[PDB]
Amino acid sequence: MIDKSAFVHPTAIVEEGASIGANAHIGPFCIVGPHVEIGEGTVLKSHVVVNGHTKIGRDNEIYQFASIGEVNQDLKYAGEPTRVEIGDRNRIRESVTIHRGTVQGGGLTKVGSDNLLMINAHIAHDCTVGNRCILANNATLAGHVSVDDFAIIGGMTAVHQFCIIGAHVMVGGCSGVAQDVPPYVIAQGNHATPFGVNIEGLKRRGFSREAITAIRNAYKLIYRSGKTLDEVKPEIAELAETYPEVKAFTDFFARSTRGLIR
Amino acid sequence: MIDKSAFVHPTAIVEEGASIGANAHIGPFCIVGPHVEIGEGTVLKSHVVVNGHTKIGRDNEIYQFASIGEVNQDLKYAGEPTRVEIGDRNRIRESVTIHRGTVQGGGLTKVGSDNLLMINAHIAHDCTVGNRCILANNATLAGHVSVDDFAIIGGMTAVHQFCIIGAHVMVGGCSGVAQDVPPYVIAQGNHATPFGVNIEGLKRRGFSREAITAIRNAYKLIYRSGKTLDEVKPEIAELAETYPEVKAFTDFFARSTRGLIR
Amino acid sequence: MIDKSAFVHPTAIVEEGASIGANAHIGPFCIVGPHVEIGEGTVLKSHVVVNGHTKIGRDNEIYQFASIGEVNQDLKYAGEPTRVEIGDRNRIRESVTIHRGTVQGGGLTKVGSDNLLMINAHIAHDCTVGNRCILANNATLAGHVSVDDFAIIGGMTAVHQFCIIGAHVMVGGCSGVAQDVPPYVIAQGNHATPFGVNIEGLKRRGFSREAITAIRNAYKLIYRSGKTLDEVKPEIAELAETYPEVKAFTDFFARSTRGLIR
Ligand SMILES: CCCCCCC[C@@H](O)CC(=O)O[C@H]1[C@H](O)[C@@H](CO)O[C@H](OP(=O)(O)OP(=O)(O)OC[C@H]2O[C@@H](n3ccc(=O)[nH]c3=O)[C@H](O)[C@@H]2O)[C@@H]1NC(C)=O
Ligand SMILES: CCCCCCC[C@@H](O)CC(=O)O[C@H]1[C@H](O)[C@@H](CO)O[C@H](OP(=O)(O)OP(=O)(O)OC[C@H]2O[C@@H](n3ccc(=O)[nH]c3=O)[C@H](O)[C@@H]2O)[C@@H]1NC(C)=O
Ligand SMILES: CCCCCCC[C@@H](O)CC(=O)O[C@H]1[C@H](O)[C@@H](CO)O[C@H](OP(=O)(O)OP(=O)(O)OC[C@H]2O[C@@H](n3ccc(=O)[nH]c3=O)[C@H](O)[C@@H]2O)[C@@H]1NC(C)=O
């Protein structure tokens, strides 16, 4: 049902069964499918396509020529009723594409809250984007990619299938990520390699001097020590019991399947 | 004429003279020009622009914000009635652009059948795309480019004007192809360089153990022997009279004008 | 007001207050905001969004799915009535985005005349594009970028914020420009480095043999001499009093803030 306080442009096509929340705005020439839920205050500017089994939260801004909930590009997909979930206060810019999941990959593509997805950013099937992320122009995620909280993907940058981009990571523009990126690190190149800790990002996000130092020491254990990952994991765990920010590393290691960028 | 069994959305604009086949679907806000032919069962999802002298075959799926048959980007083009041909069962994704040819370049842009053209793939004037190809997100072909059967162009990858991408080639993502790529080879980098035979692709497509070995030996003649191309061409021709799959090389050599990637 | 000789498609939405010039063409499903001015003979093909405080000149061709005058992607922007200016005889292709300025960056995004902006070219907030430029497919300018007269940005190429691309420059495809590019030079790579003078471009644009030689000598002072920029600036100024084309260098130096690509 469409809430009485929602605006739906006469030219927009909202198919019966769609749920449109209070004070939502559906602009000219938009198409909204029957299995779509659009939250309170969310705006679809114009020329937006939203379909599939897709739930969109509150106060989102979705710009013209964006395609949300669409059939994914995985040749394995066969039309199964898979899902998209999008949180609150996201800015989803022109030509952004966010595709539905696959049964094989868990059935769900997820995007959190307060994200900025710039022009022609691509979120493929079965991706999980967290909160407060930035995907710059043409930033492209292949299937099953995780982008953790506060992570930034630079312009023209592509991420290989199944890769994890750790929390607070900054991936430089014009890059190609082929393996997993630990939280807090700077990555650049093709293939992308690590370039230290995202110190400036952490400073701006309120991380203490002590926390940043501990994170830098954890980085040094991984990349400078010359030891194997299995050797340094318990050392990182010991460090984490004093500095809880370091726990991001161990949580990341348990999820990592592609190996680390080096 | 529009076939009686074709669906044309009330909001779609199909100009008089356009030919729409049986059980075709023209979605909301589509524009179809007077010199366009759309084949049986072909679907234009929504917000699709098809114009120029353009023939589209059967069972195609063309997604929103795609531009098919449009004026090309060659500054030499002056509005001449050039052409686009598109075959059957293609999946042409959001924002894909396929441009009409130029008189100078032969007057025709051609795409075969069973191709997957991912988001924002670009097929410039006078290009020839074969059958069963994959162009990943943002894959960009300059004018007069050939992409032969089964070839794959990775995400964010650009191909220089007049280049040929051989049959069964896999070009890696984030690459820049400046010269001709022989059939069956893996290419990566900027500028792109060869990295052996696409063994896995050939295995999946039913190539025999003997054929793959012969193809590998042909690759070795080209790249490992240290001999000139003119020296190894007759040797490849001799090999081809036992293994007919090797004939792909000699057929490719006759078309090649840019020299080989090395 | 809409001029009596202008065409506005019944499906187009031109908001009251918009100024549409003589013999302009507003195609199907276009949206034109109340603070937009569209000049004599300008064509919006179809599915074009033009909003904000935006002035567009004469004889422009703006293609489907383009977004002109839109809210920029700078997180600092807060909805202030900033501006876009676009000159005459530009060809603005499918999915091109040109964003309004920011108060912080001067309030204006400017594009001159006779430019070709290819598919999905991006002109960010506070950019200044001159005359006769070419931005190829997916060419991406970050905020506050200057692209001077006749400059060419290759396909898949990104330019870092605040950078200046000098007059008559050719930036190769698949590149990443991180610093300022002097006029007349060829740039390629990631990060982009200089590769001599754009001799062919200058020849075609009517530059004399003497002028090109002088420009080459200025290039050699900057890059071959081994001297500092401060040492060679007065030498370039001396050369410029015989060959006025060399004055482009000194004018560029005064604007440069990022340092030179080397
Ligand atoms: C990084 C920038 C690229 C742009 C990213 C945006 C694209 C995404 O929206 C779509 C996507 O990533 O889907 C893939 C899916 O994430 C993956 C896992 O589920 O599976 C697929 O990728 P994968 O690497 O597993 O390719 P396949 O094993 O399915 O084979 C697809 C084609 O590649 C050929 N191939 C494969 C391996 C090889 O070594 N050589 C080949 O030629 C093979 O013959 C076939 O034609 C999926 N692909 C296809 C084309 O089906
Ligand atoms: C690889 C990724 C890039 C994106 C690919 C998508 C673009 C295609 O849709 C369009 C396309 O490829 O068309 C070109 C056409 O395939 C070719 C052959 O027919 O001809 C043209 O390319 P080319 O390399 O021949 O350029 P021109 O010789 O026509 O000159 C165009 C501009 O380049 C300038 N130039 C040329 C050479 C040089 O050395 N320096 C220059 O500055 C010249 O002054 C002029 O302003 C065409 N270009 C233009 C801009 O007209
Ligand atoms: C080059 C190809 C990329 C595509 C280009 C197209 C994008 C443009 O349309 C938009 C644009 O360029 O705007 C930026 C604006 O030109 C600039 C100057 O005015 O300011 C901004 O860029 P900047 O480099 O200054 O980034 P900020 O300092 O504003 O911080 C933004 C985010 O980066 C994080 N950051 C910053 C520095 C650092 O070292 N590590 C970080 O994690 C920080 O925490 C925050 O989340 C602006 N960005 C944002 C996201 O606001």
Side-chain angles (χ1 to χ4, degrees):
Chain A
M1 291 185 289
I2 307 162
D3 193 283
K4 57 169 284 186
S5 65
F7 177 84
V8 176
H9 199 270
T11 62
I13 305 164
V14 179
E15 299 186 49
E16 191 64 40
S19 183
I20 311 298
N23 289 302
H25 183 100
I26 313 299
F29 321 113
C30 289
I31 301 168
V32 179
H35 306 122
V36 179
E37 296 171 40
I38 289 167
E40 191 174 0
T42 284
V43 175
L44 284 59
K45 295 283 192 164
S46 70
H47 306 88
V48 177
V49 172
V50 190
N51 56 33
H53 292 79
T54 304
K55 297 177 201 288
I56 296 163
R58 297 178 60 174
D59 292 336
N60 291 288
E61 295 181 324
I62 306 166
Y63 283 79
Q64 51 271 20
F65 321 120
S67 177
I68 308 303
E70 191 53 84
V71 173
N72 61 68
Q73 299 179 132
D74 189 351
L75 289 170
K76 292 184 292 304
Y77 180 72
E80 299 96 337
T82 53
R83 280 144 42 246
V84 169
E85 281 175 6
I86 294 161
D88 310 318
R89 299 168 308 274
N90 297 294
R91 281 166 278 187
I92 297 162
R93 299 304 309 244
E94 304 93 296
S95 305
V96 167
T97 50
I98 302 172
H99 286 169
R100 64 186 73 166
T102 62
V103 175
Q104 294 86 344
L108 176 69
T109 302
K110 192 173 177 63
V111 171
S113 298
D114 303 290
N115 300 294
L116 173 60
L117 309 180
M118 294 191 192
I119 294 149
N120 192 44
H122 173 69
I123 311 302
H125 60 97
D126 308 307
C127 285
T128 302
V129 177
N131 304 314
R132 293 281 177 186
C133 302
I134 303 170
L135 283 268
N137 292 43
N138 308 308
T140 306
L141 313 181
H144 322 271
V145 168
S146 293
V147 179
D148 297 346
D149 293 348
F150 297 93
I152 298 162
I153 313 297
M156 331 297 302
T157 293
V159 178
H160 189 97
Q161 57 185 276
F162 296 97
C163 288
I164 299 159
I165 308 301
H168 302 273
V169 163
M170 189 166 78
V171 188
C174 309
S175 293
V177 180
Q179 284 175 288
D180 299 324
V181 189
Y184 311 119
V185 316
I186 304 285
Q188 200 272 342
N190 180 226
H191 294 168
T193 62
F195 288 92
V197 172
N198 189 14
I199 293 165
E200 185 60 30
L202 299 179
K203 204 212 295 174
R204 293 179 185 187
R205 291 156 199 161
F207 280 72
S208 71
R209 176 172 59 89
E210 297 77 33
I212 296 166
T213 293
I215 287 155
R216 283 173 65 206
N217 289 345
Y219 182 97
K220 286 169 185 182
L221 285 166
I222 299 160
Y223 293 112
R224 191 186 288 195
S225 75
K227 306 171 193 171
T228 69
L229 191 60
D230 290 334
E231 279 178 306
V232 297
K233 278 159 81 170
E235 296 192 58
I236 285 164
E238 276 197 337
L239 190 58
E241 65 189 329
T242 300
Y243 313 93
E245 295 84 359
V246 177
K247 194 192 169 190
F249 286 102
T250 160
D251 293 350
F252 161 87
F253 294 142
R255 296 162 59 215
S256 177
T257 67
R258 298 277 306 171
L260 307 183
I261 57 155
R262 291 186 179 271
Chain B
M1 291 185 289
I2 307 162
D3 193 283
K4 57 169 284 186
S5 65
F7 177 84
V8 176
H9 199 270
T11 62
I13 305 164
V14 179
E15 299 186 49
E16 191 64 40
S19 183
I20 311 298
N23 289 302
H25 183 100
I26 313 299
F29 321 113
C30 289
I31 301 168
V32 179
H35 306 122
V36 179
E37 296 171 40
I38 289 167
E40 191 174 0
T42 284
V43 175
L44 284 59
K45 295 283 192 164
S46 70
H47 306 88
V48 177
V49 172
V50 190
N51 56 33
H53 292 79
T54 304
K55 297 177 201 288
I56 296 163
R58 297 178 60 174
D59 292 336
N60 291 288
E61 295 181 324
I62 306 166
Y63 283 79
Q64 51 271 20
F65 321 120
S67 177
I68 308 303
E70 191 53 84
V71 173
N72 61 68
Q73 299 179 132
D74 189 351
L75 289 170
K76 292 184 292 304
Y77 180 72
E80 299 96 337
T82 53
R83 280 144 42 246
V84 169
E85 281 175 6
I86 294 161
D88 310 318
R89 299 168 308 274
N90 297 294
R91 281 166 278 187
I92 297 162
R93 299 304 309 244
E94 304 93 296
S95 305
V96 167
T97 50
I98 302 172
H99 286 169
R100 64 186 73 166
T102 62
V103 175
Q104 294 86 344
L108 176 69
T109 302
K110 192 173 177 63
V111 171
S113 298
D114 303 290
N115 300 294
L116 173 60
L117 309 180
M118 294 191 192
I119 294 149
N120 192 44
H122 173 69
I123 311 302
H125 60 97
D126 308 307
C127 285
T128 302
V129 177
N131 304 314
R132 293 281 177 186
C133 302
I134 303 170
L135 283 268
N137 292 43
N138 308 308
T140 306
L141 313 181
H144 322 271
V145 168
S146 293
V147 179
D148 297 346
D149 293 348
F150 297 93
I152 298 162
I153 313 297
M156 331 297 302
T157 293
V159 178
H160 189 97
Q161 57 185 276
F162 296 97
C163 288
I164 299 159
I165 308 301
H168 302 273
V169 163
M170 189 166 78
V171 188
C174 309
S175 293
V177 180
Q179 284 175 288
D180 299 324
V181 189
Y184 311 119
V185 316
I186 304 285
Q188 200 272 342
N190 180 226
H191 294 168
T193 62
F195 288 92
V197 172
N198 189 14
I199 293 165
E200 185 60 30
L202 299 179
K203 204 212 295 174
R204 293 179 185 187
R205 291 156 199 161
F207 280 72
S208 71
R209 176 172 59 89
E210 297 77 33
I212 296 166
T213 293
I215 287 155
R216 283 173 65 206
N217 289 345
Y219 182 97
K220 286 169 185 182
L221 285 166
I222 299 160
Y223 293 112
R224 191 186 288 195
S225 75
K227 306 171 193 171
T228 69
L229 191 60
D230 290 334
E231 279 178 306
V232 297
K233 278 159 81 170
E235 296 192 58
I236 285 164
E238 276 197 337
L239 190 58
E241 65 189 329
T242 300
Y243 313 93
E245 295 84 359
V246 177
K247 194 192 169 190
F249 286 102
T250 160
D251 293 350
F252 161 87
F253 294 142
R255 296 162 59 215
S256 177
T257 67
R258 298 277 306 171
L260 307 183
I261 57 155
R262 291 186 179 271
Chain C
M1 291 185 289
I2 307 162
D3 193 283
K4 57 169 284 186
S5 65
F7 177 84
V8 176
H9 199 270
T11 62
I13 305 164
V14 179
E15 299 186 49
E16 191 64 40
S19 183
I20 311 298
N23 289 302
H25 183 100
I26 313 299
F29 321 113
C30 289
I31 301 168
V32 179
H35 306 122
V36 179
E37 296 171 40
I38 289 167
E40 191 174 0
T42 284
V43 175
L44 284 59
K45 295 283 192 164
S46 70
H47 306 88
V48 177
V49 172
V50 190
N51 56 33
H53 292 79
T54 304
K55 297 177 201 288
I56 296 163
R58 297 178 60 174
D59 292 336
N60 291 288
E61 295 181 324
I62 306 166
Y63 283 79
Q64 51 271 20
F65 321 120
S67 177
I68 308 303
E70 191 53 84
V71 173
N72 61 68
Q73 299 179 132
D74 189 351
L75 289 170
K76 292 184 292 304
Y77 180 72
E80 299 96 337
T82 53
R83 280 144 42 246
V84 169
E85 281 175 6
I86 294 161
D88 310 318
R89 299 168 308 274
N90 297 294
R91 281 166 278 187
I92 297 162
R93 299 304 309 244
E94 304 93 296
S95 305
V96 167
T97 50
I98 302 172
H99 286 169
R100 64 186 73 166
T102 62
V103 175
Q104 294 86 344
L108 176 69
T109 302
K110 192 173 177 63
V111 171
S113 298
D114 303 290
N115 300 294
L116 173 60
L117 309 180
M118 294 191 192
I119 294 149
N120 192 44
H122 173 69
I123 311 302
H125 60 97
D126 308 307
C127 285
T128 302
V129 177
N131 304 314
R132 293 281 177 186
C133 302
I134 303 170
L135 283 268
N137 292 43
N138 308 308
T140 306
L141 313 181
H144 322 271
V145 168
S146 293
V147 179
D148 297 346
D149 293 348
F150 297 93
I152 298 162
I153 313 297
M156 331 297 302
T157 293
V159 178
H160 189 97
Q161 57 185 276
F162 296 97
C163 288
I164 299 159
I165 308 301
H168 302 273
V169 163
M170 189 166 78
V171 188
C174 309
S175 293
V177 180
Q179 284 175 288
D180 299 324
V181 189
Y184 311 119
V185 316
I186 304 285
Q188 200 272 342
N190 180 226
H191 294 168
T193 62
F195 288 92
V197 172
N198 189 14
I199 293 165
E200 185 60 30
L202 299 179
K203 204 212 295 174
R204 293 179 185 187
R205 291 156 199 161
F207 280 72
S208 71
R209 176 172 59 89
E210 297 77 33
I212 296 166
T213 293
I215 287 155
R216 283 173 65 206
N217 289 345
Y219 182 97
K220 286 169 185 182
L221 285 166
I222 299 160
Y223 293 112
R224 191 186 288 195
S225 75
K227 306 171 193 171
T228 69
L229 191 60
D230 290 334
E231 279 178 306
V232 297
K233 278 159 81 170
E235 296 192 58
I236 285 164
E238 276 197 337
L239 190 58
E241 65 189 329
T242 300
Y243 313 93
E245 295 84 359
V246 177
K247 194 192 169 190
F249 286 102
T250 160
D251 293 350
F252 161 87
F253 294 142
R255 296 162 59 215
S256 177
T257 67
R258 298 277 306 171
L260 307 183
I261 57 155
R262 291 186 179 271

